[PDB]
């Protein structure tokens, strides 16, 4: 590894054409880069109505019935709907809000839960009840004290 | 207002490349006028000087990798020389001495 | 030498200029901007004026 | 600063009561989990939550074991929702379980604590992982 | 009016959507290290030329004395020579 | 009285405040958005904004002495701290020091930019370099820092310490050499170039002879037994 | 290793844990993704959405935005106010007694101020209030 | 793991073109702490057929307390022969 | 991993190899491998080009919050010092114009 | 400390990490630090100075001539538009300029300008436990310090928006290419160790 | 724009003073020392606080330091917009004090009927 033996070989001047020669190197091909890739990106949509300022060729918007589907949960999201003091408030969030609601490529999570779950009551695991009043003793101890 | 001249140079690799001269500003970008057509007046006024917030570049060259001044390198102090030139008296050459004794020593 | 390789961020602030040579024809990677006004504003420089007046 | 002052009070409080559960029932398959819990006021706020995404997780500091309140024998059990990332936690006393459904879910949501978390000795670190059989079925 | 755009509502396609395979990719590497790789560029001058042409010679057609005969004409007028 | 007088007061210390978001935005957008190779190198830019820079630093340093000063005077004139009262150690002279501290930087703030326009349109309309670019800015930066101990030349007559009079005299007038590079780096950038007389180019033949005859004058008031009348 | 045994769950999806390590679910929702281990991510798409727009830049909570009758009521009084400042002080500075209003309030230790009355009403009504120490 | 710039960047082999194939990128493998030269100082001056590269050390960096005390014995002798001289003359 | 006898047989044949390899994960053992954690980089098109993100390019709530300043200000020091209080009714079509709004 | 890329990183934020993990020079040019481009050789025809854009048709160069020790710059600074296509040259000094379009792409001709760029520090990434320091003698010379640590054994995959997509909304997706991603790691230091 | 209103304000504050000064008596104030010291304050203060350096610092500095420094915008955009705003009331305060009094009546009005 000495370095004068090897930069002395390494860089000369005579050989300045072929050192600064960019060149793909001969290496196996791989079937999901060489192969696969290319017919997938040939294989794009193309749309002739698309935005002529900002847009491009391959701007193809996927239908919501090709969106995936939601299987994360069965347990509904009803934070998607707005409850009605927000709606009655006129508040505006971002969380229901019907353009960031609909999502390119994947579906939200529906509102409801999903037909499958039955909600009727089984038999209780674990009961702590006492719990209510120690949270009302230390609530409002504080309270008053904070008064 | 785009290129001042262009010239076909051959390179040592023997292949011909067009070089381009840009117009110049005096360190002011905004007397510098930004123009895509061939012509002189300046048209193009734009509100965003950087449109895609890309900075513009001021390059610094490594002393190291820096090459010996070539272009037009024996007119750099032609301007003061010949500004002190111009009042300068030469002596004719008919009047000026010559063929006067060698140095001893040299 | 050793300053401008292990602390570059205070060697420009010293105002040392990059001391590595780059003659094999690949630039440094912690090239920076000379900042000179220490040695510039000084008795011995373009500001020596500056300086006789305000020493 | 008396409007913020109080709903900043009462609204922390009620964040750290509502980690805590005050009752935990089944569904009638066992598929969901209902939740009670401490309500602002004090009063029962409820929640459902399923099984499935319920998990004991062990600490991220693998020196904090010790330093848990399930070490005692009337400590705390933090089970968290990996779903909700939300955190359910019980007492340790056998009081306040169901001895019939409480085997079931001890052991089904306490899958991820395993042994492996301790490490692997010489015997078993071979094991530890799958090996990876390249060009065996063609060369 | 063009109408609202939003590029990220588009799929894009920068990355191959299947993931290689075992044996190609011990293939490639065995590939890729017995063969040279591509030059990384380098910023070194090798026989530096004149950027313009040759230095004017001391005497001939064209020296550099009429060069330096130049700086003592020089106008630039409203009317052509 | 109440009135226009604490209007003025209070609106000060608003302007105050005003050059402070002003200073602040400009300063740090050369310290953080400026192109490579620019971060440092002050000669490069234009002398316009190298003069606004400078400038920029200086209302930086002056302007909590003026902030103080005229908080003070609201304080003393609504809840009478006494603060210029001497019947019970107030100090009169020292509001005058507080505000010919930023008084005297203030005005040479407004001008040191000024020096920028004549130093940009006349190598433009000259097709020549400016002559000495660096002494023209380490000329500027001395004015700069060294104006921070000529405000005593406004409160001569004041009743002032001789040694403190003397002082603020000596270096007043030593400002005139800087100004006085300025003057002669102008003059000879005129000279040997291909002129293009424009309009710009006139205005600044007009600022330089104005600039001759005003800091003439004021050098003059340098003069202590002249500055008595 | 140590495998996930079983999922007791009718819901087939969730059977895909029953595919790797325990000590693989833990390094991948557990240890840095604990705050997106097994769970569906959505609310961070929609978030994502909402910050990237040119949405009303009118903000109240991270949840909600301002009503937009305290924006309007804000913005039509900052223009007719500012549009009153700049008219009176430019145009109608000829006549200020007929241009401008005159009162006050003081200190209630002090007597009430002359001044101190409601505008429009003087006509109508006196002012007055017993000091308070 | 490299000392030199030259031989850094003569033959790389894990370009973002080659790893791209694999689409995996590990952060040890940052250009940031790929290669460091050395504290030493290297210039190159001409050789007979080519640059070659001359190292300038001058001093070490790992002196003890005890190599700097024998040092300077001499010095503290000559401080108390200096001043008795003072004292005496 | 394993890797099969012939499979590398063939490789060594087919191809010879003279350079060394400069990344460093050929440097890392089986159990670094193992505690290796994989983390996906969302690629997509760029529009942005600066360290900076993009930038809201309108500041509404800021020219209004001035305007207020503004009037604070000379509302308050009127009031304070002058105690004058600007008569709407004077111009009352611009008072109106608020009303209308 | 470091953001967990696979739940936050999206747009800019990814394109940062991208620059730093790859250091592809298309990221890289846009994420390089203002203060400090690294230097470069003069222009000439043969070697010209070359001046990168991340998919702009031009950029605004400057130009001070050669520089030298003692005085660092040649000329007054001269601006230009530099634009895309052929070489173009300074009046003042003749030094050669190239505008190189960097693409979003990994390919060997972007690989032959690795070299162009300094390496994205790593210092000032991720989620600082030290807002900043209140020290007049390092203002500016040292960043801010950490409580915590780096980790070291993180790997990134790059991934297209919809996928991306589907790796959030859907844990059993995410586990599986995960798991085949460790198994191509895996296999991919197999082969480098049998290669050395 | 701003700068050239103050500005035109301020050579109106300047015209007062000249035409008091144009000879002795008061032609101009007609005895109101108090208010021609208001006015030569207003002048003052106007045209240095609120002429010459808005038009430096806020039309020149802001308009060309993006230009010489090479910035997509100034470190602060919303801070540059609000200087600007903030410029008016500074300006009105300091140049209508001639005009405003706390004693606004004439002379000549009866303040005995009020
Ligand atoms: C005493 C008061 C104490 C106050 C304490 C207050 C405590 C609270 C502090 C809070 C504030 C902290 C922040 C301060 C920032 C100030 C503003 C600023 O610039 O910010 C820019 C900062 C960043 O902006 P920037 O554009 O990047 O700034 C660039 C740098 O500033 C670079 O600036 P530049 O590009 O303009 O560089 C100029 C510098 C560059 O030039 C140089 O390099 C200097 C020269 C060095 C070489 C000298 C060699 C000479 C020859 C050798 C010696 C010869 C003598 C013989 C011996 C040798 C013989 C061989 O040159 C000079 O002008 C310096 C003078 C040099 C003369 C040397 C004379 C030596 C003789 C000895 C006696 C006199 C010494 C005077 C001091 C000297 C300077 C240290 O802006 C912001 O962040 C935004 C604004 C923030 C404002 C904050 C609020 C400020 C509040 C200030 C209150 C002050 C109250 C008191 C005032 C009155 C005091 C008298
Ligand atoms: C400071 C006081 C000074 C007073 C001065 C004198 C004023 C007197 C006269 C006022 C009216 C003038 C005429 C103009 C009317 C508006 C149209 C117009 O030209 O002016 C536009 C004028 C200016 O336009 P702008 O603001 O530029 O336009 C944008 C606006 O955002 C507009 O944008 P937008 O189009 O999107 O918004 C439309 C929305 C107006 O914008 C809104 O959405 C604003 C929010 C509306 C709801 C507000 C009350 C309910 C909120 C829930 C929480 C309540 C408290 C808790 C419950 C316990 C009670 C303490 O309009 C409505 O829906 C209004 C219809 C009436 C709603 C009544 C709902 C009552 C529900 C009660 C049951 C639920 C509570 C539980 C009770 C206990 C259960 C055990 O806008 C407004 O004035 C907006 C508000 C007007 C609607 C009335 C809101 C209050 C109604 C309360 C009624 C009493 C409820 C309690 C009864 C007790 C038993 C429950
Ligand atoms: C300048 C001229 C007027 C505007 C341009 C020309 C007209 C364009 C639209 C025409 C066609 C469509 C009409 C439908 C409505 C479209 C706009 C709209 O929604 O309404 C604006 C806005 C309502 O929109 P919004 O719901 O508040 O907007 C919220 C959205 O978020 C949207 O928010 P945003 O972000 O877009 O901004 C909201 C901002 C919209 O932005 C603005 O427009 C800002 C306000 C204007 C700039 C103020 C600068 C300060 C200096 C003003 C000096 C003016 C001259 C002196 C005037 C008084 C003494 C004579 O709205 C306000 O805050 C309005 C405040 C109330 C108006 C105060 C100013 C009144 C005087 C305006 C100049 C009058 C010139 C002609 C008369 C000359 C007489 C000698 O207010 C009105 O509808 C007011 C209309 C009535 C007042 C103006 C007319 C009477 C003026 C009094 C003197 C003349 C009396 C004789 C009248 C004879 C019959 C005309
Ligand atoms: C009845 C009057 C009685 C006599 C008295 C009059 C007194 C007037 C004020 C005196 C001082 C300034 C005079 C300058 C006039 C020349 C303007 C000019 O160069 O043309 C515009 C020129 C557009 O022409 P260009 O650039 O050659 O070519 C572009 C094409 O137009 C293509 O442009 P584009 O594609 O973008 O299309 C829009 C274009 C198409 O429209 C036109 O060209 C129509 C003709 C121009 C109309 C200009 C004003 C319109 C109403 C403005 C109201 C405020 C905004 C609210 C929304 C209004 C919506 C209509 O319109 C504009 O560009 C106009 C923009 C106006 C912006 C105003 C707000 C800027 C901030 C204020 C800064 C100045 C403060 C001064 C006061 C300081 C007090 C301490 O735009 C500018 O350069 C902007 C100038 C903005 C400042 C001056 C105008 C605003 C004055 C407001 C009133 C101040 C009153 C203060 C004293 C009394 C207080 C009670
Ligand atoms: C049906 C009703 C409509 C409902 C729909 C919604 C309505 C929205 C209205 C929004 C109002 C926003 C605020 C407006 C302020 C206006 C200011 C003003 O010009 O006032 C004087 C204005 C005229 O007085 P002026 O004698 O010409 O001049 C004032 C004197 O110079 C001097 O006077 P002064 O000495 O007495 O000073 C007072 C003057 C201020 O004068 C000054 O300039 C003096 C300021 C002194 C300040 C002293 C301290 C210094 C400042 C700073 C101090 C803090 C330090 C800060 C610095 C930092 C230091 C550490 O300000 C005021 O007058 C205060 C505001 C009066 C109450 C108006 C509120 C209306 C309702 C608002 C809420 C509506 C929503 C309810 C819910 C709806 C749904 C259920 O008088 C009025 O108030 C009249 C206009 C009132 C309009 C009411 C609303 C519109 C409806 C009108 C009736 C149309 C028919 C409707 C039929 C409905 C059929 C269904
Ligand atoms: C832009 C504003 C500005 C500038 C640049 C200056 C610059 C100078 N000023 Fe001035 N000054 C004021 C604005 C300014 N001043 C104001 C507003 C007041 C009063 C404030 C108040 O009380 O309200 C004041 C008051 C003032 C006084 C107090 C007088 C008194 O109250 O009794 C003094 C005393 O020396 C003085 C001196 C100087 C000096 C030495 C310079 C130097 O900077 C000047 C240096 C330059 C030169 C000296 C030029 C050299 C000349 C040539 C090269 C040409 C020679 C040619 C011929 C002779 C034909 N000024
Ligand atoms: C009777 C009197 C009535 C008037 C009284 C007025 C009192 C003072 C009012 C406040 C003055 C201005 C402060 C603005 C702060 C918020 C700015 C903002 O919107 O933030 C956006 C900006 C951030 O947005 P940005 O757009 O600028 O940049 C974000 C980054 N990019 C551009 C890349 C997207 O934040 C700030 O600039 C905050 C302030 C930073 C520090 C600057 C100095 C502040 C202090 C100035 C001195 C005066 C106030 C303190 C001292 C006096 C106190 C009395
Ligand atoms: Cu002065
Ligand atoms: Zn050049």
């Given at each position: ?147 | ?106 | ?55 | ?139 | ?81 | ?18 050059t402070?978001?002003?200073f602040t935005?400009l300063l740090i957008?050369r310290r ?10 002050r ?7 190298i003069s606004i820079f400078l400038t920029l630093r200086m209302l930086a340093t002056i302007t ?41 930087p203030?005005?040479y703030v407004?001008?040191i ?27 500027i930066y001395?004015?700069a820092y060294?104006?921070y ?81 | ?133 | ?89 | ?101 | ?196 | ?114």
């Open positions: 590894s000495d370095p004068n033996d090897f930069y002395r070989d390494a860089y000369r001047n005579e050989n300045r054409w072929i050192d600064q020669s960019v060149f793909t190197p001969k290496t196996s091909k791989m079937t999901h880069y060489d192969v696969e890739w290319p017919k997938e990106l040939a294989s794009r949509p193309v749309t002739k109505k698309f935005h002529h300022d900002k847009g491009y060729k391959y701007d193809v918007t996927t239908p919501y019935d090709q969106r995936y589907n939601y299987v994360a949960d069965r347990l509904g999201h009803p934070e998607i709907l707005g409850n009605p003091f927000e709606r009655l408030m006129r508040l505006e969030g971002d969380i229901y809000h019907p353009n960031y609601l609909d999502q390119p490529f994947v579906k939200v999570p529906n509102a409801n839960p999903n037909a499958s779950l039955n909600f009727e009551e089984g038999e209780v695991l674990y009961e702590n009840t006492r719990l209510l009043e120690w949270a009302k003793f230390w609530n409002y101890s504080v309270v008053v004290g904070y008064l | 207002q785009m290129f001042v001249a262009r010239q076909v140079v051959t390179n040592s690799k023997g292949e011909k490349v067009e070089v381009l001269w840009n117009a110049q500003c005096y360190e002011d970008i905004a007397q510098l006028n930004v123009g895509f057509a061939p012509v002189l007046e300046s048209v193009d006024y734009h509100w965003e000087i950087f449109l895609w917030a890309d900075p513009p570049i001021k390059p610094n060259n490594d002393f190291d990798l820096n090459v010996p001044c070539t272009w037009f390198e024996y007119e750099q102090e032609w301007w003061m020389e010949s500004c002190i030139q111009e009042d300068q008296f030469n002596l004719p050459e008919d009047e000026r001495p010559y063929n006067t004794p060698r140095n001893p020593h040299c | 030498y050793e300053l401008f390789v292990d602390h570059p961020d205070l060697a420009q602030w010293t105002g040392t200029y990059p001391k590595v040579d780059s003659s094999h024809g690949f630039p440094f990677y912690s090239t920076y901007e000379m900042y000179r006004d220490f040695q510039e504003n000084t008795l011995n420089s373009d500001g020596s004026f500056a300086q006789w007046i305000t020493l | 600063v008396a409007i913020y002052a109080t709903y900043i009070a009462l609204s922390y409080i009620n964040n750290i009561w509502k980690d805590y559960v005050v009752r935990a029932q089944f569904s009638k398959d066992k598929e969901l989990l209902f939740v009670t819990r401490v309500s602002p006021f004090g009063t029962t706020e409820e929640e459902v939550y399923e099984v499935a995404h319920l998990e004991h997780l062990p600490p991220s500091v693998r020196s904090g074991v010790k330093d848990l309140s399930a070490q005692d024998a009337d400590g705390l059990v933090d089970v968290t929702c990996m779903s909700s990332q939300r955190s359910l936690v019980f007492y340790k006393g056998d009081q306040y379980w169901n001895p019939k459904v409480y085997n079931d879910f001890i052991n089904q949501t306490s899958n991820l604590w395993t042994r492996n978390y301790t490490g692997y000795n010489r015997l078993e670190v071979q094991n530890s992982v799958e090996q990876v059989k390249i060009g065996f079925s063609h060369s | 009016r063009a109408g609202p755009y939003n590029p990220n509502r588009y799929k894009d396609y920068y990355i191959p959507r299947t993931l290689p395979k075992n044996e190609e990719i011990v293939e490639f590497v065995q590939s890729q290290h017995s063969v040279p790789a591509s030059p990384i560029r380098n910023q070194r001058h090798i026989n530096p030329v004149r950027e313009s042409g040759p230095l004017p010679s001391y005497d001939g057609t064209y020296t550099m004395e009429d060069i330096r005969a130049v700086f003592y004409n020089t106008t630039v007028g409203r009317d052509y020579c | 009285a109440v009135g226009s007088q604490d209007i003025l007061i209070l609106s000060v210390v608003f302007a105050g405040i005003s402070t978001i002003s935005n957008t953080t958005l400026a192109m490579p190779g620019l971060r440092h190198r000669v490069l830019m234009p002398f316009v904004t909590p002495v003026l902030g103080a000063a005229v908080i003070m005077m609201a304080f003393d004139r609504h809840w009478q701290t006494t603060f210029f009262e001497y019947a019970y150690g107030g100090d009169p002279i020292l509001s005058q020091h507080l505000f010919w501290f930023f008084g005297h203030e005005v407004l001008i930019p000024t020096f920028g326009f004549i130093n940009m349109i006349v190598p433009h309309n000259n097709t020549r370099r400016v002559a000495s670019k660096h002494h023209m800015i380490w000329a001395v004015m060294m104006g101990l000529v405000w005593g030349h406004h409160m001569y007559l004041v009743g002032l310490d001789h040694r403190s009079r003397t002082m603020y005299s000596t270096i007043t007038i030593m400002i005139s050499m800087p100004a006085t590079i300025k003057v002669v780096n102008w003059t000879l950038s005129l000279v040997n170039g291909a002129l293009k007389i424009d309009l710009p180019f006139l205005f600044s033949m007009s600022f330089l002879l104005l600039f001759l005859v005003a800091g003439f004058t004021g050098m003059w008031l340098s003069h202590v037994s002249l500055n008595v009348s | 290793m140590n495998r996930f045994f079983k999922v007791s769950s009718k819901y087939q999806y969730y059977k895909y844990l029953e595919q790797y390590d325990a000590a693989f679910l833990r390094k991948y929702q557990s240890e840095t993704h604990w705050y997106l281990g097994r769970r569906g991510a959505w609310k961070n798409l929609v978030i994502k959405y909402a910050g990237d727009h040119i949405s009303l830049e009118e903000e109240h909570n991270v949840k909600y935005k301002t009503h937009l009758s305290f924006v309007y009521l804000s913005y039509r009084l900052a223009w007719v106010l500012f549009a009153y400042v700049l008219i009176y002080n430019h145009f109608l500075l000829g006549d200020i007694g007929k241009t401008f209003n005159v009162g006050e309030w003081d200190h209630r230790l002090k007597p009430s101020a002359e001044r101190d009355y409601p505008t429009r009403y003087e006509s109508l009504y006196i002012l007055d209030r017993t000091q308070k120490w | 793991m490299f000392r030199w710039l030259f031989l850094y960047w003569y033959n790389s082999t894990d370009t973002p073109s080659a790893i791209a194939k694999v689409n995996l990128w590990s952060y040890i493998n940052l250009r940031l702490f790929k290669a460091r030269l050395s504290s030493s100082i290297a210039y190159y001056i001409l050789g007979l057929n080519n640059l070659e590269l001359k190292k300038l050390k001058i001093f070490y960096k790992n002196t003890y307390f005890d190599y700097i005390y024998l040092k300077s014995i001499p010095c503290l002798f000559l401080i108390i022969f200096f001043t008795n001289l003072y004292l005496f003359l | 991993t394993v890797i099969n006898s012939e499979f590398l047989t063939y490789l060594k044949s087919n191809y010879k190899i003279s350079f060394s390899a400069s990344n460093i994960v050929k440097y890392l053992s089986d159990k670094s491998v193992n505690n290796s954690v994989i983390l996906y980089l969302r690629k997509n098109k760029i529009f942005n080009k600066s360290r900076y993100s993009r930038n809201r390019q309108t500041y509404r709530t800021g020219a209004y919050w001035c305007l207020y300043v503004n009037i604070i200000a000379v509302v308050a020091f009127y009031f304070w010092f002058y105690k004058f209080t600007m008569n709407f009714g004077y111009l009352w079509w611009l008072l109106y114009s608020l009303i209308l709004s | 400390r470091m953001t967990n890329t696979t739940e936050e990183a999206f747009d800019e934020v990814s394109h940062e990490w991208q620059a730093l993990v790859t250091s592809n020079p298309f990221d890289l040019n846009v994420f390089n630090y203002l203060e400090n481009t690294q230097t470069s050789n003069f222009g000439t025809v043969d070697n010209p100075l070359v001046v990168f854009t991340s998919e702009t048709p031009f950029r605004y160069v400057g130009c001070t001539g050669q520089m030298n020790e003692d005085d660092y710059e040649g000329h007054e600074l001269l601006f230009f538009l530099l634009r895309e296509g052929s070489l173009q040259r300074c009046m003042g000094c003749g030094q050669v300029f190239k505008l190189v379009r960097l693409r979003n792409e990994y390919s060997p001709e972007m690989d032959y300008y690795l070299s162009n760029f300094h390496p994205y520090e790593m210092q000032e990434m991720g989620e600082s436990d030290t807002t900043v320091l209140m020290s007049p003698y390092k203002y500016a010379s040292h960043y801010e310090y950490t409580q915590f640590e780096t980790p070291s054994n993180m790997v990134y995959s790059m991934v297209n928006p919809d996928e991306h997509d589907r790796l959030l909304v859907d844990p059993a997706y995410r586990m599986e290419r995960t798991k085949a991603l460790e198994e191509k790691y895996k296999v991919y230091t197999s082969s480098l160790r049998e290669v050395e | 724009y701003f700068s050239m209103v103050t500005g035109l304000s301020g050579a109106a504050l300047a015209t007062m003073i000249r035409l008091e000064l144009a000879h002795p008596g008061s032609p101009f104030f007609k005895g109101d020392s108090l208010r021609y010291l208001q006015v030569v304050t207003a002048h003052g203060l106007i045209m240095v606080f609120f002429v010459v350096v808005p038009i430096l610092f806020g039309g020149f500095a802001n308009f060309l330091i993006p230009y010489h420094v090479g910035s997509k915008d100034v470190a602060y955009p919303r801070l540059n917009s609000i200087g600007f705003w903030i410029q008016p009331c500074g300006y009105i305060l300091l140049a209508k004090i001639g005009f405003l009094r706390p004693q606004f009546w004439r002379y000549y009005d009866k303040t005995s009927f009020s």
